[PDB]
Amino acid sequence: MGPGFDFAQAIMKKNTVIARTEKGEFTMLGVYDRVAVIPTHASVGEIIYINDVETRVLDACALRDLTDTNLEITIVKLDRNQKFRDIRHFLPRCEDDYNDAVLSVHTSKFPNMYIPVGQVTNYGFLNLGGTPTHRILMYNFPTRAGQCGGVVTTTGKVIGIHVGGNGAQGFAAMLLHSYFTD
Numbered sequence: 001m002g003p004g005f006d007f008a009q010a011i012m013k014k015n016t017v018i019a020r021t022e023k024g025e026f027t028m029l030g031v032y033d034r035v036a037v038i039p040t041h042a043s044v045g046e047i048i049y050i051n052d053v054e055t056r057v058l059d060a061c062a063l064r065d066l067t068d069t070n071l072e073i074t075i076v077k078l079d080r081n082q083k084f085r086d087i088r089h090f091l092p093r094c095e096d097d098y099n100d101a102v103l104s105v106h107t108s109k110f111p112n113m114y115i116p117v118g119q120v121t122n123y124g125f126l127n128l129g130g131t132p133t134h135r136i137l138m139y140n141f142p143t144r145a146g147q148c149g150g151v152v153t154t155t156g157k158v159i160g161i162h163v164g165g166n167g168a169q170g171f172a173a174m175l176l177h178s179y180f181t182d
Contacts, residue, residue: 020049026149030084143170
């Protein structure tokens with residue numbers, strides 16, 4: 001509807017796949033080459049479904065900060081026959097607050113879904129499902145089951161992936177450029 005939705009759509013149409021694990025269907029952001037991200041609670045194993053195709057997982061790493069605190073991001077390398085458009089230049093270098101973000105989701109249940117979530121706070125610490133978690137972004141939108149893995153963008157930046165909510169607020173794990181240096 002506006003330039004925020006334009007940037008979000010451009011990311012969704014080229015840099016997402018539908019990922020299915022034993023724990024459900026997730027929006028999955030492809031970052032570069034065969035490297036993608038998903039919330040760590042997806043519990044990626046040795047085999048994942050990507051757009052309903054059985055795919056070997058070549059590597060999966062659940063990220064933690066240097067305090068050994070959960071970040072809720074898993075970086076997955078997929079045995080896929082095709083590379084993602086490289087979007088690393090759209091990743092922030094530092095922890096930050098944002099104005100006017102969009103949360104975008106694409107699954108079997110919620111195709112072509114875009115949500116203007118408004119102001120994004122650098123919230124920091126969250127007890128997420130009982131797990132101490134750092135680098136959390138917060139938005140005042142009542143997000144629901146089925147939006148985990150959704151991409152959070154502003155114009156020109158891909159800033160996080162949705163990992164939870166409390167009924168009134170939604171929470172995303174930060175994406176930082178330093179997670180994807182090769």
